[PDB]
Structures are given as structure tokens and as C-alpha cells.
């Protein structure tokens, strides 16, 4: 054994040993229990940084733990390859997105191999490859013919100067981000998943996920946004019907989640596009101007909660069907057309928004709900005004005194008897818009024929292949300019036709890749039946909280869709979810000649701080999440060249609990490295003093107290680490526990024959307990200690006999006079000592049937019965 730890030498040799043994290349082996551990696959956008590494190290720790416990572990990796990163790199470097992507994949794959993750690379997928995306095209066509996918007009941001559709993220102040031109709202045909048809299933099945973090479930419930409310119709007054047609001339319909407050409605509000709005604005130029301002605004929820709520009165009136009040209709900028009725009732006394709107325009506030003896002031909003759970109705006729639910059901019965309303369930969830006017994405398998319409591509003709010989330049999608792509024949009639040139939302690839990993070379379907039956669902999923809503909801939705197609037999894709904390790092910049800032990478600066290239100073700025945005991503390859993969992995796992943020630290890397040399030094010095022996096992009676204590520490440590990897998933405390075992080891004389056997037992356990964290050094150290294969020796077992301490002899006194002796456990409570002392032979004789006035218990010394 070499004296000094040399990771540059031992880490490649360990990886080759694992690769040759194929321990990470797994089949559907019925002779072993399966374990599927998945980390969220990365965008191949250039280089991974230590943040990504922390994510994948957490997954590798969990995978290697289960591997050591005899599981058949699948831990797959792949590339989430479509999307805007490559399209942007094409506009900057004039290179093809495919070429840029496959280049990044090659570099990133070596980054990962360098870290020694226990990954089944035979299951690698790259989602921009036809052999992958043909199957989401397949599912698209199957759902399109069921109407689950459908085509309909939708709104987009059209930039008239750049001649391109813009995402909302690039529309600032109503204008294009790179053009500054006024953005036009265009209606264009697009494709949608009818995810609203699955809202109830998606919501209710969250209750099955007993091992998900509750905040993620809460975020999904709030996003789906189910409500149980009431449709309510207000009859249009006789004087207010001019210009109104059909049902709009007869009533104004709204939806409310508080029908228990309908007796407190004091006005009604409608969207600018509502037919009552347009009819009252016929002769009113002020309402026309207000309607136009509304249409020229951002309907985004991000802007609307921060939006000043405004309105104008219409001079039209409707009638409350419960109390007969005549309420004026207002046009209001917060009521959105298309979200149900486009009209709402207002109850200022019990809704905070209505209260402020009514305080602005001095509109009436009518209390209809009281909470106990609480004081109600119409000139100040109090949180109890909206309390739905502890109120009763006041000022409500025969509804007075009821709670929320009873009033809700009573209002429903009364409204239904008059034909003026009925219960209704609504969801905030909207259908999922699939179409992207972008090149680097999965083509939509639709052919447009002037005779047949929108026709899906037959399954025998999939994939519709995206051409890779393309360099986009933002002047619109190049697919719409390539007739050798869009010119085709109709699959139904054979006539000339045109391929759809929009591509798919790239969330589609990540909505099912976890099933493709189960059979990534299967060419007859999305996933083979045998492999889906074997692997079931993902046992453990690890990824950032930024994907807790959309990505997870889409993945759950695709799972249910695939189940409904008979492709899988699980309802939910991920059984457990670990959301790792972000790795953060200080940033550095230099003022640009254009007045901007040149963000510099920490690996190219020196520290007052200077750039490592010229010696001129650079500015030290704030510490934030590692990302390419501020160029503060630490490349693991640089850490590995300087210290080794095990150091990188150990620092990430030790610096903080996995869910807590983790600050980059040169000092932390050095501490991790010193511990690895301590571990190496410990085993080297042990083997220098005599060589390897058979580890102690079996009956420890006759071992010295010092060695019994070390075995107690050993098996306590094994129990703790097993619980930290397996239940708590807290790796920093697992490493700290092994450090404590070594500290006790260092303080124990292990030179005797029995001492060397216990030493061997301790070291053989330490190196296996740490193998999930630092497998390279632990693999090498194991092989110097023991001849068996580490993965066949398995996870260390807890010797329960090593955990029992010795019994203690206690004196039994009666009124301070020694009357007997008792033997009790070291863990014996004060009540067990009292029990045992009272039953002592000499005690019961010298008590003379008299009861104990008091019993004094000195733990480990005596019991005095008075």
C-alpha cells in the first residue's frame, strides 16, 4: 500500500474496476428487488458546475446505499436537449443547434464520468434524437384523435420588427425586448393538451403521495386551483337592456366562491369585453377609453396582483335574486374575459379587493357575516372580514345565523328553486399550450391538407424528422422557410399538403423520459410492457424546487395519459421527492466599455482581488446561486484536477444538509481533502503495524472494556448512518458520525491480538459506510483490508449484542441501613430501581409490612427506603 493518498491515480483505476464489473449496467432481474433512483437530467447547455454536481452526488449516494443493500439499482442519465439555449448559441456563433448540443453532451458526459457516478450509461438518452422524440409524436397523434390534444386559436405576442413570436418574458413595457417595438396581440391556431379534463384526478391523486414534501403538494393544489362555488344570475333591469341581445339582455351571470355573502353584494363588475360593457360604452366615450386601456394591458397574473384596480360605472343595473336589490354594473380592469362568465359580484365587507375598490369609489359596504363579538368598521379592512370558517350570517333574512357550509347549501336550494343559480366547480388550471414558433424542438406530427384539414401523421410514418442542417437567426422559424421540409403529401387523400412547422413545448420531453429509461432502445413503443412492469415507478426523484409545479404536474399528467393508453400500470411517476438546496458562490465583474459588466468566473480571479490573466483588479460582488447568468459556476473538472472527485463529493455532502443552501468555500474543499488523507493515513498505519486480520465477530464477552466501548461506538455508528442514508436522507450527519467513530478509534489501544481484530472490524465498516459518499478512496482502501468484493460483502450489519452495556450492582437500604443488593441494567430508570429495591429479600423483611414514606434513589449507587 502506498503511503500517500493520490486521487489522480486511484480514481481512474476505481472507475475502470467498476465499469469492467458492470455493477451499474442493470437488467430487469426478477431475482433482485428493484430500486430506481433518478436525478433530473440536465440541459446540455455547455458545462456542468458544482451545483449540478451536488444534485447528482445526492442521487449517487442514495443509489450506492441501496446497491450495497442488495438492490438492483437503476440510476440513469440523459440530456434534455431541445430548447432555446442551442437556438441562441446559433445566433451568436453561427453554428447549428444540433452540433452545439452534441458537442456539449460529449464534454458534459466526461465531466460526469470523471466524478464516478454509478450510472447505467447503456440507458443514456438524448431527447433531440429521432429515436426518442418519435414516441412523443406517436402519443400526440393518439391523443389528437381522441380529442385530448386539439387545435384552436390562441393569443401570441407578435413583434412586427423582428418578425417573430415573443414569449411574455421578452415583452417589457408592452414592447419587444430586442426591438423596443409595440407588441401586437395575434390570434393564431395552436395545439393544446386538454389537461383540464384530468384536473380532478391530478388534484386528488396528490393524497396518494405520502412521501412527498407537503409544500410541493400545496404548490400543485394551488396551481390546479379547484374551487366549489355558485353560478348566480342577476336579472337585467328593464331600463338597462338597450343594445343587449339574447341571454345578455335577460341576466348577468357570475361565479362566486362565497354565495353565503350574496346578501351583501353592493355592486357588480364586468370585463371590458363583456357585452354589457360594450353596450353601455355605445354613447359613452369615457367607457370606450377605459375599455381600450384594459385591452392594452398585461393580463399576466404577475402584473395584475401589482395592478392598480380601476373601474368606471356603466349606468346599467341588475337585480340581486335573493334580496331584490338593484345593483349598478361597473366595468373593471381586474375582471378577465374568458375566465368563466367575465363578470363577478362585489361584496366589499368581506373581500379585501372589493373593500379597496369600494373605498376608492366610496361604494357601499354591507356586513352580512359576523365572527363572534368582533368589531366591524366599514372604514378599515380586518382579516376576520373574510374568515370563512368561524362566521355566521347577519342581515340575511331566513339565512341568519348559519355557518358557511349551511348557508352555501341553503343559498343553492333557494337559487335553484328560482332558476337563478346552481352549484358549480371551477379550476384555475388552463389547458396546456404545446405550440412553439421555434426551430430546435420536436416537430408536431400534423399535416395540413386543404381537403382533409389537420391530419395526424400515421404511426408507420413517424418520426417526422427535424432537419439538423439548420442555422437559425431569429428572423422567424427556418422550418417555415424550408419547402424540402414542409412540402409533403396528405396521408389521407395523397394530395399536396403542408407539414405543421411549429415545434413542441420542450417540457414534453421531460414529461416521460423516466419511462423511456426503462427500455431506451425499444422500437415498438414508448416503453416495453415487460420493463414498465419490472421497474414500476421511480422510487426516488431528486431535483430543484423550480420544477415543483409545471414539470412535476406535466410528468404526472403524462403518466396518467400513458396509463390510460395501456402503456404503464402506475398512477404516479415518483414515489419520493428530494429537493436539494442551491449551491451559491460569490460573483465578480468588470465594467464594460459599453457601460455594462463583464462577469468573470471565480476560477480566473485571484484574491482586493485581481483577474488571473492580467493582474488588473476586478470587482467582488454579491453571492448567489451558481449559474451561467453571472458566470459564477465552478467547473468540477478544475476541482478534480486539483483535489480529486472524492474531495468534491465529500465537500458537497458534508457542508450542509442536502435541502439547505450551500456556499462555495475554498476552506471547505481543503477540509474535505484533509479528511480523506486522515482516512488514508489511518488504514495505512493500521496495515503497517501487522497486516490484515480476520475482523472481530461473535461473542464479545472477555473483550476489554476499552474494546467493548469501541465496538459499541462502531455499531451505534452503523445504526446512525443507516438511518441517515435510508430514512432521514441527511448525509452531512452521516459523515460526522463516521468521524466520531474514527476519533474513538484513535483513542483506543488496538495493538493486542483482540485489539487488531476490532480495529479491522472498525475500518472495514468505516470504509463501507463512506463508500456511497467517496467510493473511489473507499474501494481502494477496502481492497487493502479485505479480499472480497465490496459490493458482495454488502452494507455493514448492526451487532445488537455490542450495544448492551454492563449491569450495575446497587445497594438496598432500609432507613439508611444496608439490607440487600440488587443487580439492574445500566439503562434502568429510577422507577425500575424503586421496583427492584422494594422486592429485595432483605428489604421486605426489615420493612415489617410498613409502607415506604419516601424512597431515595441514587442512580448507580443506592436505593434508600424510608
Ligand X SMILES: CC(C)C[C@H](N)C(=O)NS(=O)(=O)OC[C@H]1O[C@@H](n2cnc3c(N)nccc32)[C@H](O)[C@@H]1O
Positions at the binding site for ATP: 628
**Measured distance CA(270)–CA(48) in Å, rounded:** 51
**Residue 671 three-state SS:** helix
Q: At what angle do helices 666-688 and 645-655 cross, to 10 degrees?
A: 110
In Å, how far are 233, 240, 288 from 313, measured between CA atoms?
A: 20, 13, 12
Yes or no: say if 141 and 459 are a contact pair by the CB < 8 Å rule.
yes
42 touches, from ligand X, Zn ion, none (C-beta below 5 to 8 Å by class): ligand X
Residue of the chain from 167, 182, 475, 493 that contacts Zn ion (CB under 5 A): 493
Yes or no: say if 36 and 536 are a contact pair by the CB < 8 Å rule.
yes
421 touches, from Zn ion, ligand X, none (C-beta below 5 to 8 Å by class): none
Residue 751, class by beta-carbon neighbours within 10 Å (0-12 exposed, 13-18 middle, 19+ buried)?
A: exposed
Is the Cβ of residue 213 or residue 544 nearer to ligand X in the bound state? 544
**Measured distance CA(685)–CA(694) in Å, rounded:** 17
Q: Candidates 204-212, 326-334, 451-459, 785-793 — which segment interacts with Zn ion by CB under 5 A?
A: 451-459
Is the Cβ of residue 490 or residue 774 nearer to Zn ion in the bound state? 490
Instruction: Please state the residue numbers annotated as binding site.
Output: 628
Residue window 534-573: x/- pattern of binding to Zn ion, with contact defined by CB under 5 A: ----------------------------------------
In Å, how far are 345, 402, 427 from 261, measured between CA atoms?
A: 10, 11, 21
441 touches, from ligand X, Zn ion, none (C-beta below 5 to 8 Å by class): none
Is the Cβ of residue 452 or residue 793 nearer to Zn ion in the bound state? 452
Residue of the chain from 451, 678, 830, 845 that contacts Zn ion (CB under 5 A): 451
Shortest distance in whole angstroms from residue 337 CB to ligand X? 33
The 8-class DSSP code of residue 728 comes to I
Degrees, nearest 5: CA angle 234-240-244: 85
Yes or no: say if 792 and 783 are a contact pair by the CB < 8 Å rule.
no
Backbone dihedral region for residue 550 (phi beyond 0: left; psi -120 to 50: alpha; all else: beta) = alpha
**Residue 830 three-state SS:** helix
Residue of the chain from 307, 492, 611, 736 that contacts Zn ion (CB under 5 A): 492
Shortest distance in whole angstroms from residue 488 CB to Zn ion? 11
3-state secondary structure 291-328: HHHHHCCCCCHHHHCCCCCCEEEEEEEEECCCCCCEEE
User: Per rule CB under 5 A, is residue 449 in the interface with Zn ion?
Assistant: yes
Shortest distance in whole angstroms from residue 136 CB to Zn ion? 24
| Residue of 68, 31, 34 whose CA lies nearest to 797 | 68
Nine-digit cell string for 747: 483513542
In the chain, what's the furthest Cα-to-Cα distance? 114
Is the Cβ of residue 297 or residue 544 nearer to ligand X in the bound state? 544
Residue of the chain from 371, 452, 611, 692 that contacts Zn ion (CB under 5 A): 452
Shortest distance in whole angstroms from residue 52 CB to ligand X? 5
Nine-digit cell string for 68: 450495497
Is the Cβ of residue 495 or residue 860 nearer to Zn ion in the bound state? 495
597 touches, from ligand X, Zn ion, none (C-beta below 5 to 8 Å by class): none
Is the Cβ of residue 501 or residue 632 nearer to Zn ion in the bound state? 501
Shortest distance in whole angstroms from residue 734 CB to ligand X? 20
Shortest distance in whole angstroms from residue 542 CB to ligand X? 7
490 touches, from ligand X, Zn ion, none (C-beta below 5 to 8 Å by class): Zn ion
Is the Cβ of residue 49 or residue 776 nearer to ligand X in the bound state? 49
H or E segment and range at residue 714:
helix 705-723
Residues that bind ligand X (CB under 6 A): 40-43, 51-52, 54-55, 80, 510, 543-544, 547, 551, 580, 582-583, 625-626
543 touches, from ligand X, Zn ion, none (C-beta below 5 to 8 Å by class): ligand X
Shortest distance in whole angstroms from residue 662 CB to ligand X? 7
Question: For the sheet containing 574-578, what is the strand order?
Answer: 72-74, 34-39, 538-542, 574-578
Q: Candidates 371-379, 482-490, 574-582, 827-835 — which segment interacts with Zn ion by CB under 5 A?
A: 482-490
Is the Cβ of residue 449 or residue 548 nearer to Zn ion in the bound state? 449
Shortest distance in whole angstroms from residue 276 CB to Zn ion? 44
- The residues that bridge with 176 in the sheet, in sequence order, are 171
Is the Cβ of residue 288 or residue 488 nearer to Zn ion in the bound state? 488
Shortest distance in whole angstroms from residue 581 CB to ligand X? 7
User: Per rule CB under 5 A, is residue 490 in the interface with Zn ion?
Assistant: yes
Beta-carbon neighbour count of residue 504 at 10 Å?
Answer: 22
Yes or no: say if 724 and 733 are a contact pair by the CB < 8 Å rule.
yes
User: Per rule CB under 5 A, is residue 230 in the interface with Zn ion?
Assistant: no
Shortest distance in whole angstroms from residue 59 CB to ligand X? 10
| Residue of 164, 204, 215, 213 whose CA lies nearest to 188 | 164
H or E segment and range at residue 336:
none
Is the Cβ of residue 382 or residue 665 nearer to ligand X in the bound state? 665
Q: Candidates 4-12, 134-142, 259-267, 483-491 — which segment interacts with Zn ion by CB under 5 A?
A: 483-491
| Residue of 128, 57, 109 whose CA lies nearest to 503 | 128
The 8-class DSSP code of residue 546 comes to G
Q: Candidates 94-102, 266-274, 490-498, 724-732 — which segment interacts with Zn ion by CB under 5 A?
A: 490-498
Can you give the binding site for Zn ion, defined by CB under 5 A? Answer: 449, 451-452, 490, 492-493
Amino acid at each position: 500500500m502506498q503511503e500517500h493518498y493520490q486521487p489522480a491515480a486511484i480514481e481512474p483505476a476505481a472507475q475502470k474496476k467498476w465499469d469492467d464489473a458492470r455493477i451499474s449496467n442493470v437488467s430487469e432481474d426478477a431475482s433482485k428487488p428493484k430500486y430506481y433512483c433518478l436525478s433530473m437530467f440536465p440541459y446540455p447547455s455547455g458545462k456542468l458546475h458544482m451545483g449540478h454536481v451536488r444534485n447528482y452526488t445526492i442521487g449517487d449516494v442514495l443509489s450506492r446505499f441501496k446497491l450495497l443493500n442488495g438492490f438492483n439499482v437503476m440510476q440513469p442519465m440523459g440530456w434534455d436537449a431541445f430548447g432555446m439555449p442551442a437556438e441562441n448559441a446559433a445566433m451568436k456563433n453561427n453554428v447549428a443547434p444540433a452540433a452545439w448540443t452534441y458537442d456539449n453532451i460529449e464534454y458534459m458526459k466526461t465531466q460526469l464520468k470523471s466524478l464516478g457516478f454509478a450510472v447505467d450509461w447503456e440507458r443514456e438518452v438524448a431527447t433531440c434524437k429521432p429515436e426518442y422524440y418519435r414516441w412523443e409524436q406517436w402519443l400526440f397523434t393518439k391523443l389528437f384523435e381522441k380529442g385530448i390534444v386539439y387545435r384552436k386559436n390562441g393569443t401570441v405576442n407578435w413583434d412586427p420588427v423582428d418578425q417573430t413570436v415573443l414569449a411574455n418574458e421578452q415583452v417589457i413595457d408592452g414592447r419587444g425586448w430586442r426591438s423596443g417595438a409595440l407588441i401586437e396581440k395575434r390570434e393564431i391556431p395552436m395545439y393544446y393538451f386538454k389537461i383540464t379534463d384530468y384536473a380532478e384526478e391530478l388534484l386528488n391523486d396528490l393524497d396518494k403521495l405520502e412521501h412527498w414534501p407537503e409544500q410541493v403538494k400545496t404548490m400543485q393544489r394551488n396551481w390546479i386551483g379547484k374551487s366549489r362555488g355558485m353560478t348566480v344570475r342577476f336579472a337585467v333591469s328593464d331600463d338597462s337592456k338597450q343594445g343587449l341581445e339574447g341571454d345578455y339582455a335577460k341576466f348577468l351571470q357570475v361565479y362566486t366562491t362565497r354565495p353565503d355573502t350574496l346578501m351583501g353584494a353592493t355592486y357588480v363588475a364586468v370585463a371590458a369585453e363583456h357585452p354589457l360593457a360594450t353596450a353601455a360604452a355605445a354613447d359613452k366615450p369615457e367607457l370606450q377609453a377605459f375599455i381600450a386601456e384594459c385591452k392594452a394591458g398585461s393580463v399576466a397574473e404577475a402584473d395584475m396582483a401589482t395592478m392598480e384596480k380601476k373601474g368606471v360605472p356603466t349606468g346599467r343595473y341588475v337585480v340581486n335574486p335573493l334580496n331584490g336589490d338593484k345593483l349598478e354594473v361597473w366595468i373593471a380592469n381586474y375582471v378577465l374575459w374568458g375566465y368563466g362568465d367575465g363578470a363577478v359580484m362585489a361584496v366589499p365587507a368581506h373581500d379585501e379587493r372589493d373593500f379597496e375598490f369600494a373605498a376608492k369609489y366610496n361604494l357601499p359596504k354591507k356586513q352580512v357575516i359576523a365572527v363572534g363579538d368582533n368589531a366591524f368598521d366599514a372604514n378599515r379592512w380586518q382579516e376576520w372580514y373574510g374568515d370563512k370558517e368561524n362566521g355566521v350570517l347577519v342581515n340575511s333574512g331566513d339565512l341568519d345565523g348559519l355557518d358557511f357550509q349551511t348557508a352555501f347549501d341553503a343559498v343553492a336550494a333557494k337559487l335553484q328553486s328560482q332558476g337563478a343559480g346552481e352549484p358549480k366547480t371551477q379550476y384555475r388550471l388552463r389547458d396546456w399550450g404545446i405550440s412553439r414558433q421555434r426551430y430546435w424542438g420536436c416537430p408536431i406530427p400534423i399535416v395540413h391538407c386543404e381537403k382533409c384539414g389537420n391530419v395526424p401523421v400515421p404511426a408507420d410514418q413517424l418520426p417526422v424528422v427535424l432537419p439538423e442542417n439548420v442555422v437559425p437567426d431569429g428572423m422567424g422559424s427556418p422550418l417555415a422557410k424550408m419547402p424540402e421540409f414542409y412540402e409533403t403529401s396528405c396521408p389521407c387523400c395523397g394530395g399536396a399538403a403542408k407539414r405543421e412547422t411549429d415545434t413542441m413545448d420542450t417540457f414534453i420531453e421531460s414529461s416521460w423520459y423516466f419511462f423511456r429509461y426503462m427500455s431506451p432502445k425499444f422500437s415498438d413503443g414508448m416503453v416495453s410492457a415487460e420493463s414498465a412492469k419490472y421497474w414500476g415507478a421511480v422510487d426516488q426523484y431528486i431535483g430543484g424546487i423550480e420544477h415543483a409545479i409545471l414539470h412535476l404536474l406535466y410528468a404526472r399528467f403524462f403518466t396518467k395519459l400513458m396509463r390510460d393508453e395501456g402503456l404503464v400500470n402506475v398512477d404516479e411517476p415518483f414515489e419520493r421527492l428530494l429537493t436539494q438546496g442551491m449551491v451559491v458562490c460569490e460573483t465578480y465583474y468588470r465594467e464594460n466599455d459599453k457601460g455594462g459588466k463583464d462577469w468573470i468566473n471565480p476560477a480566473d480571479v485571484e484574491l482586493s482581488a485581481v483577474l488571473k490573466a492580467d493582474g488588473l483588479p476586478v470587482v467582488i460582488s454579491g453571492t448567489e446561486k451558481m449559474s451561467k447568468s453571472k458566470n459564477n459556476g465552478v467547473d468540477p473538472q478544475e476541482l478534480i484536477n486539483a483535489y480529486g472527485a472524492d474531495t468534491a463529493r465529500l465537500f458537497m455532502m458534508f457542508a450542509a444538509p442536502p435541502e439547505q443552501s450551500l456556499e462555495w468555500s475554498d476552506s471547505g474543499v481543503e477540509g474535505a481533502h484533509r479528511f480523506l488523507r486522515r482516512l488514508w493515513r489511518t488504514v495505512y498505519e493500521y496495515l503497517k503495524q501487522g497486516g490484515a486480520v480476520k475482523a472481530f465477530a461473535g461473542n464479545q464477552d472477555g473483550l476489554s472494556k476499552e474494546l467493548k466501548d469501541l465496538r459499541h461506538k462502531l455499531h451505534s455508528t452503523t445504526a446512525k448512518v443507516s438511518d441517515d442514508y435510508g430514512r432521514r436522507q441527511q448525509f452531512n450527519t452521516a459523515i460526522a458520525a463516521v468521524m466520531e467513530l474514527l476519533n474513538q478509534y484513535d483513542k483506543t489501544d488496538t495493538g493486542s491480538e483482540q485489539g487488531r481484530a476490532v480495529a479491522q472490524e472498525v475500518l472495514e465498516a468505516a470504509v463501507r459506510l463512506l463508500w456511497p459518499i467517496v467510493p473511489h478512496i473507499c474501494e481502494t482502501l477496502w481492497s487493502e483490508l479485505n479480499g472480497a468484493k465490496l459490493w458482495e460483502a454488502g452494507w455493514p450489519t448492526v451487532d445488537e449484542a455490542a450495544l448492551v452495556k454492563s449491569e450495575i450492582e446497587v445497594m438496598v437500604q432500609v432507613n439508611g441501613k444496608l439490607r440487600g443488593k440488587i443487580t439492574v441494567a445500566a439503562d434502568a430508570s429510577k422507577a425500575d430501581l424503586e421496583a427492584a429495591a422494594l422486592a429485595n429479600e432483605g428489604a421486605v423483611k426489615f420493612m415489617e409490612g410498613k409502607p415506604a414514606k419516601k424512597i431515595i434513589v441514587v442512580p448507580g449507587r443506592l436505593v434508600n427506603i424510608v
